[PDB]
C-alpha cells in the first residue's frame, strides 16, 4: 500500500451521471435501517463508501422519537459500501460522533468524529480503526466539522472545523494530519464571514472548499489552501446565490469578497458544494429559494472569478415537489479511473420527517450520488420515495 | 489478474442439472428480501452471482404496492452470491437501473444500468464499482438492454441495446467496451424484425444471441457478431416456436429470415434463450403457449440451420401448474471448470403476484439455475413455492 | 493451496469437550433463521463449517408448516461458520438438496446434493461452487447419501450412497471423486444388511464408516474401504446396540457379521456414529432405547473386534428429558492442530417440533458439537433450549 | 504472521477519549440483537473486537425471560467488530461459555470459555477457531475467569482463573499457554484475600492485574506476574476504595497488603480495572458507592505504591443517574499505533433490566470504550440510552 498522490487537476466535466441511490428509508419501512442524517461519500483506492451519522436507533422503532434533534450521546459515524442502505448489519462503526469527516490516504481510512457536551466537545481521530489523536473545542461552543469527505494528498489529510456562535462571528480552523496525528493547524481570518460544513476536494495539489455561511451570507464562502495551510478566503463570485434560504437570482448581486444577505435570508443556510472548472464553476442548490426541496446543479460561466450570471448548463436531479437537504463533494482517485485527472462527484441528502413533515415523530434521510462525465447527461427526479407517515407514527 | 479469453467453443451438452434455487419469495414471507424482477446470473473467474432489479422495497411491506410497474427511480441493479435470496443485508449495489446487463472480464465486474425518464434515459457503465462511461438514448423511447449477462472476450465486453417502439420497428445496437469505456458501436439493420432482451453467450470467439421479438414474431431473433461488431441477423430456423405467446407446434412453419406471427401472438413476447449445438439447438420455452407458466428445454435437431421440427430431447424443469417468466443464458469460464470448452447454463425467473395473481398488490420473482452436463438428466418441477396471498395483501 | 493428505492415524481420545452450540431455534423465535434438519460439520484447512438442509423457509413463518416432510423442491444444502445459527443472511448456498454430503480436499469445498423426484433423483456435485458432475439414481428409489461430512485424502474425496427400499434389501455404493468428477465407484455386496446415512472418517489412509441399518439391525453397519474402493462390510461387533430403536443392553447379543434385530426394533433407525480406537470404539447413542431423546457416548473395550459388553467410559451430553436426533462424525485436519494424528469430533442434532411435539406445525433442529481430547471431560446437558410452541403455532 | 512481542512499557496517559459506543440495546428494540452481559474488548494486530457472553436469545423475544441468571447451557462467547451491536448476523461464535477470556497472540485468536455444571465445569481453549486444550475445575465450585482480555507476550498467553466459594477463601490460579496448549500453571497463595474477574494488561514484559474481591475487601486485589508465573499479590495501595459496594473515601484507610472491608460492603463487588502509571494509578469506579450506577476514572498520585488519597485527575464518562456495571482493561499493540509504548484502554458495561429495573423480565448490557491519550480530555455522560420497559415486558 502506498499513499495516494491526489495532486492531479480536477477533471472538467460537462454533465453528471447518477451512480447510486440507497433507498434507505423505503427499505427501512420493514428492514432494519438506522435513523440517520448528514450522509456523505468518500473513496479509497479500491472502493467508495457512504458514511453517515446515526441516531443510535432504527427506523420504525420507538427510539426514533425526537430524532430531529442534532446532538446526543447516541449518535455515531458509521459506513456502508456505496449504494447500500445504512442498515443494522452491514454498518461499520467508525467513531462516536454528532459531527464528522472521513477520507482515505491510500493506506488507511481516517475518520474524525466529534462528541461530548456542547460547551466542551472534542474530536477523536481514528486511523485504520485505531484512536490516534484528539482535537479539543477551543471556543467551547459546539465544535463542528464538514459532514463530508476530507482531503488527502501525499500522505497528509486535511479538514476544516468551526467553533463558536451559529449566527454571528465564529472561529474557523484548517487542520493537517499524517497517519491520524495532527501535524499543523491554522486559524482562518474571516471577519464578517461565517464558515461551516465545508465541501472540499483536491485540485492540482490545493484543497478547494465551498462552505455554508450561517450568518449574513446567502452566497457560499470559498476557502482554498495549500500543504502549508496558507489560505485564501472569500465568497463564490458568481452573481447566482446558491445557499438556502436565498432570494431569486434577479434580486441578487454577487461578490467575491463580502457576505451578501438580508431579505429574510440571514441566520440559516444548508450544506452545499461547488467545483471549480478553470474560471467557471459547477454549483449545486435546492430548487426552492426558501426550503430544502428539489435539487439542481448549475454551470456558471466564469463564476469562480467574477460576478457572472451566465448559466451555461443546468441539470435537475430532484424536482421541487420532493425534499432535499445537504449536498457535498468528493473525488474519485486515479487508482480507480486510470485517468490523469480527478473525477468530481457529489451526493445529495433527501430528508424525511421533521420539520417539514410534522406528522412523523422522526427525522432521517436517504441519498443519491452523481459523478461528473465528459458529456451532457439528462436529469430526472430520483426522490427518496418513502411513503409517510410510517407505522411508528400512528 | 488477467483478462479472460473466453474464445473457446461452447460445450456440447446432453442434459441440464439444477445448480441453485434461491427460494427468495418463500424466505421473504418473514425475512427481509427485496421485491425484484428480471434476475440473471453472470460468472467471474472465481464465483457466479445473481443480479436483479429491485423495486427499492421489501416483500411484505407497503412499499411493495404497485410493483407490477416496470420503471421507477427506485429500481436498482444489485447482486448476491449464486443461490442466495436477494436480501436486504447481502445485496451488493451495482447500478441505479430499471434495465440492465452485467458481466466479468477476468479482472473486474462490468455493470450497465439504465435509468431516467422514458423519453431521455441513459445507461451508466460501472467498472470495478466506479462509473466510467454513459450511453444516452438515441431514439428517446425507453432505452433498454438484455436483462442478462453480457459477454467478455479478451478484455472486451459486448452487449445489445434497443431504443424505440415496443410494438413496431425499433432501433437495435451492439456495443463494445474495454475497461468500462465504449470503444465501438454498430446499428443492426433488421427491417421488419424486432430485437429485445437478448440472451447472449460466447462461442468460438463470436457472440451468439437469442432474443425477444415483441412485434410480429413468435419465433426468436438470432443475432451473431464478432469483435468488429460485424453481424448476422435473422430468426431461429427451427420449425418449433419458442416465444410466448405462440401457437401450437403443428400450426407453425419455421423461417430463418422472417418474423412468423399472427394468430393472436403479435405485440408481446417473453425473454428467452437458446444454445447453438453445432447445427442443432437447445431452446427454452414456457409450457403454456399463451401464458408465462411452466418451463421446458428442447434439443432440436439441426434447429439452428433449418426449419426442423425434430425434437431429440425434452426436459421439463417446471410444470405448467406453476408460474415462470424470463429465462436467460450464461457460461462458466475455463478458470472454474478446467475444461477446454465453455459450459452453457441458464436461469429461470418465476414470477409471483400481478398480473396473474390479482389478489396480491405486488409483483416479484425467484429463480432456479441449471447448467449443461455431458449426460442426460431427469427433469422435475422446482417451483417458486411461496403461498399467496401474503400478509401485506390482507 | 495443496491437497490435504489426511492419511494420518485417528487420535486416541479419552474424552469429548464441547466446541460449539448454535442455539438456532431459540434465536429463530425472533431472528430470521432457516427451518432445517440433517445438520452436519465439515472442516477445511482453515475453518470448520456447519452444513444443513433447509426447508426453504424461516422459523415462525407460515411456510414452516408441514416441515416434518423429508423431501421437497424447496430444500437446499447451505452452510454457516461453525457455531452460527443457520440464518437467512449468513447462510452460504451450496446445492439444491434433500439429501447431501460435503467435505474439503485442501483446495476447495466439495458438495454433493440430491434433488428431483423420488423415482428419478440425481446428485449434483459442486466443486469450488461450480457444478462439475452428476450421479443418477440407479434403482429409482430415493437415491440418498450420508447427511454428514465426506472424506478427502490425497486429493480424492469419497462418500457412500444408497438407492432402494427403506425397509428391505437395498443397493449401496461407494464413490470416489477428484476435483468434483466421479473417477471410481463400487457396489457393496451386503446381503441381509442395510446401509444408510454413513458417518465416515479417515483413519491411517482408509475410510471407516459407521452407518444406519433401517431394516433388520439395531446394531450399526461398519463399512471400511481404501483408495481402490476395496471394502470390508459388517456390523459393529460390540455387544452393546447403538441404533434407535433398540432393546436394553442385557437383552442384546452382539455380532460382527449379522444384523441383530427383532423385539419391535425392525424397520427404523437413526443416523449415528462411532470411532475406532485401536481395537476399542467410541460409539454414540440416544439415551432412550425407543425415542430420539438424550445422548451419550460410550467407550467399549475391544468393541470394534469382538462382542464386548465392557463399557470403559460413558459421557452424557444431553439428558433423557430432552430431544436429540441425528449424530455424525468428522475430523480436524493437521493444518489446524499441528498434531500427528486426526482429531475425532462429532455433532449432535436436537430435533424440535413434529412428530414428538404435536402442538407445533413445524419440525427443525439445532446442534451441539464436541471434539476428542487426551483427557477425561465431564458431561452436562446442552439441550436445544427453545420454548415451544412458537408464535406461528398459535 | 509473527507473534506480538507486547513487552513494551505501558504508555503514560493524561486523559481518556471515547473510541466506541455500540448502542446495542437501543438497536435491539427493533433489530435482532443478542441478550448479553460481560462484554469485553481485545485487540489483534489489525483490529479490535468486542467479545460478549450471549444468553442464546435475542432482545424483545420471550427467550429473554429470566436472563438475570448467570449460567446456563445456552450462553456462548461471541464477538463482533469494535463498535457493532452484538447482533444475530455479525456475531462470530467463539466458544460455549458462561465465563470467558480472549486475546490475540499476533498470529491467531485465543478464546477460553467455561461451561458445564457448577460442580464440574471446564474451560475449553480455542485457538484459531479450533479446540486445542481443556482446563477442568479443580475445586468443583464454579470455575470462572476474567470476563476481559487475556494477555499475550512473545507467543505466550496468560490468564487468571478462580475456583471455590464466592464469599470466603477460594483458590486462584495463573495459566500460561502457547498455541492454545496450557504449558504452565501456578496457584496463587492469598490467605484472607479473594480474587475474581481480573483485568490484566502487559507492562514492560510483566502482566499486571486489578481484580475483584468478593469477600472481605472493598479495595481491589493487585496481582503481578512474569513469564515464569512468579507473582506478587496484594491490594491496590491507594487510600481510595474502588470496588462497589464501598464506603465514602473519608471513611476508608488504604492498605497494600490487607483486604479492607466491613460497614456493609462485604460479600459483593464488581469487576473493575486500574492502570499503573509509574508509581501512580488510573483507577475506575462507579459513582455510587452502593450500586452499579455512574462511572468515573481517577488518577491517584503514588496510588500504586502507597495509601495516597491525592486525586490528581478525575473524569466522569457516565453520570450517576445512569446504570453502569463491569469495566475492564486492554491495550492496543504497537502494530496499530506505531508507538514505542502500549496504549491503555478500558471498556464500560452498562446493564439494563434486572435487578435494578424490576419491570423488565430480562437483563442485558451495552458498552462504551475509551482509550488513553497524552492530553486531558473532557468527560460527558454516554449512557446506554434505551427506553424501558420494552415490548416483551408488557
Ligand atoms: C446547530 O446547527 C448546525 C447544523 O445544521 C444542521 C441543519 O440541518 O441545518 C444539521 C447539523 N446536525 C449535525 N451535524 N448533527 C448541525 N451541526 C451540529 C453540530 O449540530 C448549523 O450548521 C449551525 O451551527
Ligand atoms: C416495456 O416492456 C418491455 C419489458 O417487458 C417486460 C415484461 O415482463 O414483458 C419487463 C420489463 N421490465 C424492466 N426491464 N424493468 C420491460 N422493459 C422495460 C425497460 O420496462 C418489453 O420488452 C417491450 O419493450
Ligand atoms: C425416508 O427416510 C429416510 C431418512 O430418515 C429420516 C429420519 O428422520 O429418520 C430423515 C431423512 N430426511 C432427509 N434426508 N431429507 C431421510 N432421508 C430422505 C432422503 O428422505 C430413512 O433413512 C429411510 O430410507
Ligand atoms: C456468581 O457470581 C459471580 C459473578 O458475578 C456477576 C455479577 O454481576 O456480579 C456476574 C457473573 N456472570 C457470569 N460471568 N456469567 C458471575 N460469574 C459467574 C461464573 O456466574 C461473582 O463474581 C461471585 O463468584
Ligand atoms: C414520542 O414522544 C412524544 C413526547 O414524549 C410522545 O407523546 C409519543 O408517544 C412518542 N412516540 C413514541 C412512539 O414513543
Ligand atoms: C479544465 O479547463 C480549464 C479551462 O479551459 C483548463 O485550464 C484546464 O486545463 C482543464 N483541466 C483539465 C484537467 O482538462
Ligand atoms: C395499495 O394501493 C392501493 C391503491 O392506492 C390501496 O388501495 C391499497 O390500500 C394499497 N395497499 C397498501 C398495503 O398500501
Ligand atoms: C459440438 O458438436 C458439433 C457437431 O458435432 C461439433 O462440430 C463440435 O466440435 C462440438 N463441440 C465441442 C466443443 O465438442
Ligand atoms: C398449517 O397447515 C394446516 C393444514 O392445511 C392448516 O390447517 C394450518 O392453518 C396451517 N398453519 C398455518 C400457520 O398456515
Ligand atoms: C491408538 O491406540 C492403539 C491401541 O493401543 C494404538 O495401536 C495406536 O498406535 C494409537 N494411535 C495413536 C495415534 O496414538
Ligand atoms: C417470564 O416468566 C414468567 C415466570 O414464568 C412468566 O410469568 C412471564 O409470563 C414470562 N414472560 C414471557 C414473555 O414469557
Ligand atoms: C511513565 O512515567 C513513569 C514515571 O515518571 C516513568 O518512569 C516511565 O518511564 C514512563 N513511561 C513511559 C512509557 O513514558
Ligand atoms: Ca446563509
Ligand atoms: Ca413475440
Ligand atoms: Ca435399525
Ligand atoms: Ca468487594
Residue numbers in the entry:
A (entry chain A), B (entry chain A), C (entry chain A), D (entry chain A): 82 to 164, 164A, 165 to 306, 308 to 347, 347A, 347B, 348 to 385, 387 to 413, ...
Quote from the publication.
NA, which is a sialidase, catalyzes hydrolysis of terminally linked sialic acid and functions as the receptor-destroying element of influenza A and B viruses. Additionally, influenza A NA is further classified into two groups: group 1 (N1, N4, N5 and N8) and group 2 (N2, N3, N6, N7 and N9), based upon primary sequence. Group 1 NAs contain a 150-cavity (formed by amino acids 147–151 of the 150-loop) in their active site, whereas group 2 NAs lack this cavity.
N5 on the other hand contains Val149 with no 147–150 salt bridge and displays a 150-cavity like all other structure-known NAs with Val149 and no 147–150 salt bridge. To determine the structural basis of the inhibition of laninamivir relative to zanamivir, we solved the very first complex structures of laninamivir with p57N2, p09N1 and N5 at resolutions of 1.8 Å, 1.8 Å and 1.6 Å, respectively; and the complex structures of zanamivir with p57N2, p09N1 and N5 at 1.9 Å, 1.9 Å and 1.6 Å, respectively. The typical group 1 N5 contains a 150-cavity in its uncomplexed structure and inhibition of N5 by laninamivir and zanamivir was better than inhibition of p09N1 and p57N2, which contain no 150-cavity in their uncomplexed structures. Unlike p09N1 and p57N2, N5 contains Tyr347, which forms an additional hydrogen bond with the carboxylate of each inhibitor. The additional hydrogen bond between Tyr347 and the inhibitor carboxylate is also a key factor in explaining the higher N5 inhibition relative to p09N1 and p57N2. However, like the closed 150-loop, this residue also makes the active site cavity smaller and in this way may also limit access of inhibitors to the N5 active site. In the open state of the 150-loop, when the 150-cavity is formed, Asp151 shifts over 1.5 Å (the Asp151 Cγ is shifted over 2 Å in N5) away from the ligand binding site, which should facilitate entry of inhibitors like zanamivir and laninamivir. The typical group 1 N5 contains a 150-cavity in its uncomplexed structure and inhibition of N5 by both laninamivir and zanamivir was the highest. Therefore, we provide structural and functional evidence that the open 150-loop of a typical group 1 NA may facilitate the entry of the 4-guanidino group of zanamivir and laninamivir into the NA active site, relative to the closed 150-loop of group 2 NAs. Laninamivir was in a similar range with zanamivir for N5, p09N1 and p57N2 with IC50 values of 0.90 nM, 1.83 nM and 3.12 nM, respectively.
